[PDB]
Write a protein that binds this ligand. Structure first.
Ligand SMILES: Cc1cc2nc3c(=O)[nH]c(=O)nc-3n(C[C@H](O)[C@H](O)[C@H](O)COP(=O)(O)O)c2cc1C
Ligand SMILES: Cc1cc2nc3c(=O)[nH]c(=O)nc-3n(C[C@H](O)[C@H](O)[C@H](O)COP(=O)(O)O)c2cc1C
Ligand SMILES: Cc1cc2nc3c(=O)[nH]c(=O)nc-3n(C[C@H](O)[C@H](O)[C@H](O)COP(=O)(O)O)c2cc1C
Ligand SMILES: Cc1cc2nc3c(=O)[nH]c(=O)nc-3n(C[C@H](O)[C@H](O)[C@H](O)COP(=O)(O)O)c2cc1C
Ligand SMILES: [Ca+2]
Ligand SMILES: [Ca+2]
Ligand SMILES: [Ca+2]
Ligand SMILES: [Ca+2]
Ligand SMILES: [Ca+2]
Lengths: 211, 211, 212, 213
């Protein structure tokens, strides 16, 4: 099965499904993984603070270290080209200067406006509770995740989003500071070896209401 | 006035930006809003439990009732064709029998599989802490939200995801049970009246690494 | 979509206000909502706006346990209720006259001049009332508020049972209030119903009203 | 005249607009059908052992207004201009209606005769042996509960009221022809169509009137 790119928006959305068995002999070139991640990170985020951080778990070394933490999802882990583990940086505002300074350098805003924005943004973010900030980073990182899955599909790959992993211990196992980086979601990615099962969705009346 | 659609996936992704001023006289036909939402809700969710609930705020009356709660986001609120307020249902498992029943009716699984899945899913979901369930529904609802913003853009509309609203009171203001439904984020949607500002993203090396 | 339980039709609220005696023991009314109900209840009228009512909201296991014997045969309501509201009347209610009428000046409803003219007759009137006469005043005022409380509770989706059968001689002391100053008027059990109220009969109105 | 007025059906609107109006339209009179609807709803109020001790003198005639005029003292404008001055009395021998009330419950299939007898077996000795002061407390409370509901219902019908305690309670029963030993005045309520807006009034912060225990 040739890798087959998909250019049509509706066809990408329609083909995005949870594949759970990938081709073990297919590895995604780094340059292509970086293109996919670059596209995903164009996602929006609260005050453009981009709190998402991705561990691209490709080696047998690291996969083996995290295998038990993935429990009944071991076969996605085993067969995938990579297991992407998406964390949220609870001190994401540490990059405010870099990010907003980049906007100034790229002539998207003046320094004057950068200072006026950051004068309210920084105290707001710094004063958030841990729980409030966890909510923020979970939401932003998930927005990026969805765009990642769609882009992966456009490139001809398939994914499986995964929450059934040990979120209490995963940062420690991989070596990230568990006080600062909270795991949000994992995404298995690769070339499909088995078709996804189709799934149902609720009737629209069960999920939206006009007011 | 039929809007110009965007059929190419990459162009849709590249064109998704936060628009904050909409055409006040342009209202999205209900059939089209429902097509957008139907496409959005093909997003994945944990155990396919689809905890998202969208309040499509479009009337003068409800817009006026929620105006104070939107604070400095009044322009998006007033000019939008709709302000979508996305809640997560903390008791989303009450629809498990319905959803999984639908999967058997549509020949996607046999009843033995359905029963075995529910035998572990229900206890797990029913015994999660409020905070744990809040994490699940924030993540799922955000996945859906991203697909909604992209679909809206494919349709020629624009959006602005919004977090700066009174989440403590919003459920009560609109009449939803705040014990069951937590607000996740809002999305202003309509026909653009002012171009979005372009914005920067972090270099790839500051957001991902290979392990 | 699961909504807040509200009854907004005025007649519907009055019609469904019935004495519920068995409540859902697991359901507790959030404080914000109790305060909203009490805020609306206290919009009731009172003689010279002196607002003599004082509400002990008995919700804790410890205080429930303490008042339990005082509630005698109303044990179903005390036990199962989200709260037992015990309404007292302040026989020295006029001690808040400067505060109350002061707030009216602050809120631009009357001038200080008018506040002084009013209090110049109201204070000697209230201060020279007998104990029994003041008890009549606070019983009436507190009952007016209590009815509006029960109606507002029903409008919020809750039910009530007004209760007079408790130990009024000792309840103030049990709760920690000065029995000389604060007289018990009535108690109101409040919560989410676990059993429908029994319906009750009313007299034909021509046995209780006449045109003169 | 006697036009039926604009109703307020929203519970919060009714509660928010219930204020003491002291000047009514002197030429507006409330039709009996409407006053009776108002009283019918009001008497759905609860009362101790459902004994319903309230008795309403609906003073509407020029003749009876004149008779009670001096008894209303500085409340003369409310009396004069009102469609009616309601004077609510409490019956200190309210248990004389027990057989009727409880009998009606049996007739209406809300309880068995068997249960009615058991209830009255304790209720009657209890009520008949209360002190005069204890009974006055009961009837004041019950009648006040009904009075609040009457004022709200009146407002829902588009009318306004003014509760009034400043009248001659010592003599009012005798003046209108009620047995002053048996019937005690609780409060009066002026009712009519407003001719001037009520003054807005303040309430204490709730922290001064309630606490959680
Ligand atoms: C969760 C979330 C909350 C946001 N809150 C607001 C908001 O309250 N008001 C607003 O104008 N924009 C809000 N934004 C828009 C962001 O500022 C915007 O996405 C970011 O600056 C990137 O710009 P772009 O969306 O044009 O790519 C929010 C975005 C997200 C994802
Ligand atoms: C946040 C999240 C967590 C998930 N967790 C797992 C998981 O641990 N293991 C797994 O096999 N699938 C997992 N799923 C996949 C869902 O079961 C799947 O998305 C859902 O059944 C819908 O099917 P679809 O993705 O093919 O549309 C997860 C999905 C999401 C969004
Ligand atoms: C002042 C007062 C005291 C009451 N005392 C009790 C009581 O001690 N125990 C009880 O079960 N009900 C008590 N009741 C409830 C009455 O029995 C009830 O209101 C009456 O039977 C009418 O029924 P309803 O409230 O359902 O309309 C009391 C009611 C009032 C107004
Ligand atoms: C029991 C009672 C007796 C009252 N007595 C009089 C009275 O004699 N004359 C009068 O003008 N108002 C009287 N008032 C009206 C009060 O002054 C009024 O309710 C209070 O100032 C609150 O204003 P509001 O009713 O507009 O909310 C009485 C009220 C009550 C409840
Ligand atoms: Ca830079
Ligand atoms: Ca500059
Ligand atoms: Ca650390
Ligand atoms: Ca009969
Ligand atoms: Ca029998």
């Amino acid at each position: 099965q040739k890798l087959t790119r998909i250019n049509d928006f509706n066809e990408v959305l329609n083909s995005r499904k949870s594949v759970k068995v990938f081709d073990e002999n297919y590895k995604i070139p780094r340059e292509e993984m970086d293109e996919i991640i670059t596209k995903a990170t164009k996602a929006p985020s609260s005050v453009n603070m981009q709190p998402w951080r991705i561990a691209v778990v490709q080696s047998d070394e690291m996969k083996e270290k995290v295998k038990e933490s993935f429990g009944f999802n071991s076969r996605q882990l085993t067969t995938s080209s990579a297991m992407l583990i998406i964390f949220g940086d609870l001190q994401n505002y540490e990059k405010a200067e870099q990010i907003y300074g980049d906007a100034v350098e790229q002539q998207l805003m003046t320094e004057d406006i950068k200072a006026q924005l950051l004068d309210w943004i920084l105290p707001y973010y710094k004063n958030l509770s841990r729980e409030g900030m966890k909510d923020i980073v979970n939401i932003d990182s998930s927005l990026m995740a969805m765009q990642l899955m769609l882009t992966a599909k456009a490139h001809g790959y398939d994914t499986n989003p995964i929450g059934g992993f040990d979120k209490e211990n995963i940062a420690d196992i991989i070596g990230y500071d568990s006080d600062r980086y909270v795991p949000v979601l994992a995404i298995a990615i690769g070339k499909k070896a088995q078709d996804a099962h189709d799934s149902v969705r609720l009737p629209i009346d069960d999920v939206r209401e006009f007011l």
